[PDB]
């Protein structure tokens, strides 16, 4: 039964863990918003081979995932879970957390995302051959951007995306439930103090993140079956481990 003092301390711990592992500082992403790929540069990306675009994207996704793994390792209570459950949570949650974090690098004003040094719209990604998934990710990012998350809100929300007691295959479900609950208390306490509890009903339904992640796995299966050597030779092994069927 976590006291109010313990909950307040948890708020601080989670926010620290996130700040230390946020990958890019928000200030840097916001400054780069005026830096947008030219028509000619966009054409260059669209003319890239499917394999090279997939390779680049798998690399950048993996880099983001590595910071999320580091976030998990520093997150209060995560390393006290058993090895099986650490794995289960990260395998299911890593991509979900990256997708939420990604809204920081999304500009709702012109519908662009920070990629390889400049902002580009969904058209930058045409060579992947997954327009429906890409548009879905842009839609998701746009929905999150509307909420105007603070960094602390992203910290607390992403902690909850990760510590999900409903993930299939957990061995110590009750242990995860307790950690999840304390994190919910932390999130709710922080929101109440800042007059922000209104955002709770505007957060995306869990099925939304699950759908984006399943779609990712499905599209990778399509690419990998057609280009098995590329995946074996060039893709980060962690990306293969997490997402390959």
């Amino acid at each position: 039964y976590a006291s109010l003092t313990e909950i307040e301390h948890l708020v601080q711990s989670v926010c620290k863990s996130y700040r230390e592992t946020c990958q890019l500082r928000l200030e840097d992403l916001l400054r780069q918003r005026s830096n947008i790929f030219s028509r000619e540069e966009v054409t260059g990306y669209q003319r890239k081979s499917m394999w090279e675009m997939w390779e680049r994207c798998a690399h950048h996704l993996t880099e983001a995932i590595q910071y999320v793994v580091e976030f998990a390792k520093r997150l209060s209570g995560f390393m006290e879970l058993c090895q099986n459950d650490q794995i289960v949570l990260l395998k299911a949650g890593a991509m979900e957390v990256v997708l939420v974090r990604m809204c920081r690098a999304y500009n709702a004003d012109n519908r662009t995302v920070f990629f390889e040094g400049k902002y580009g719209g969904m058209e930058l990604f045409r060579a992947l051959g997954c327009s429906e998934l890409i548009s879905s990710i842009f839609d998701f990012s746009h929905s999150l951007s509307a909420l105007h998350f603070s960094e602390d809100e992203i910290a607390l929300y992403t902690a909850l995306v990760l510590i999900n007691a409903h993930r299939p295959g957990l061995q110590e479900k009750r242990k995860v439930e307790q950690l999840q609950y304390n994190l919910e208390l932390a999130f709710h306490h922080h929101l109440s103090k800042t007059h922000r509890q209104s955002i709770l009903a505007k957060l995306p339904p869990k099925g939304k993140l699950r759908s984006l992640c399943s779609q990712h796995v499905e599209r990778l299966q399509i690419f990998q079956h057609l280009h098995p050597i590329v995946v074996q030779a060039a893709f980060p092994p962690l990306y293969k481990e997490l997402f390959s069927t």
């Binding site: 590595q66 793994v69 998990a72 390792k73 090895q83 794995i87 990260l90 395998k91 962690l238 481990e241």
Partner: peptide
């Protein structure tokens, strides 16, 4: 696995 290695096991 690689996750296991990154987690420190």
């Amino acid at each position: 696995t690689l996750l296991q290695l990154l987690l420190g096991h």
